[PDB]
Design a binder for these strands. Structure first.
Length: 242
DNA sequence: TTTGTTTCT
DNA sequence: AGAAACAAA
């Protein structure tokens, strides 16, 4: 139940979530690759824009983030909207709902233009402010999956370019994508937002870090590279979530 | 029907 | 609120 899950996640800790983020999640590997082939500010802007169109995909998330990273490496991006207008219709893994996705990018372009290196630093030190700022730029509910996911992916990109780590705020809830929703239904009849926020508060692990533990493992990522103690805790969690 | 849902009233 | 938004099925 919830108490057992919270105990295991608490033993994994932010330290274990950070390990999974930086060593196991293919999405972080894709971002690391792209960060070597484009300037840091454009990199962060692209990661936010990509997150806001990362829904109802035509491939798995790990496939899609690698397609994004390989596409943009070495490119000279003059307009994020125009870049996506060319990229999406020719993509393999993001072919659905393109007009709607492009309109979202158009809506956020002004906000993205504020993301200088120092503004990125400020938002990484205050991700709750970033959360609300993205939602207000889009005119949407900040509880939505793509907005909360964009904060998570911002934190991946920012830690790469700033060479520093700040934990996600406890108040930002888990991204309710299909993997998380399906898992939650196997575990409980409680709504996922409340279920995972309670586990986050009990364990001390913010929901976006819980997402980093759960989401790669739900896709079948191996835990074998974790050191023995963390590996044991991840094996215990896999018995609950797989 | 939908591989990390949102827009549109 | 929940159907339409596009692709695939």
């Amino acid at each position: 139940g919830s108490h057992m899950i919270a105990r295991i996640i608490g033993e994994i800790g932010i330290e274990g979530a950070r390990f999974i983020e930086e060593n196991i999640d293919e999405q972080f590997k894709a971002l690391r690759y792209l960060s070597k082939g484009i300037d840091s500010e454009t990199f962060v802007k692209l990661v936010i824009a990509n997150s806001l169109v990362s829904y109802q995909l035509t491939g798995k998330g790990e496939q899609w983030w690698w397609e994004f990273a390989k596409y943009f490496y070495g490119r000279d991006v003059k307009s994020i909207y125009l870049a996506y207008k060319e990229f999406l219709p020719n993509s393999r893994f993001n072919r659905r709902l393109i007009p709607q996705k492009l309109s979202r990018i158009r809506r956020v372009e002004t906000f993205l233009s504020t993301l200088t290196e120092e503004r990125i630093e400020e938002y990484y030190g205050d991700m709750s402010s970033l959360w609300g700022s993205i939602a207000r730029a889009l005119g949407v509910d900040k509880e939505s999956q793509t907005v909360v996911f964009s904060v998570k992916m911002f934190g991946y990109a920012a830690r790469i370019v700033l060479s520093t780590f700040n934990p996600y705020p406890m108040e930002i809830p888990i991204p309710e994508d299909s993997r998380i929703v399906k898992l939650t239904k196997k575990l409980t009849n409680e709504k996922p937002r409340k279920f995972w926020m309670k586990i986050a508060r009990e364990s001390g692990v913010p929901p976006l870090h819980i997402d980093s533990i759960l989401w790669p493992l739900l896709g079948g990522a191996s835990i074998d590279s974790a050191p023995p103690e963390l590996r044991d805790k991840l094996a215990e969690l896999i018995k609950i979530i797989r």
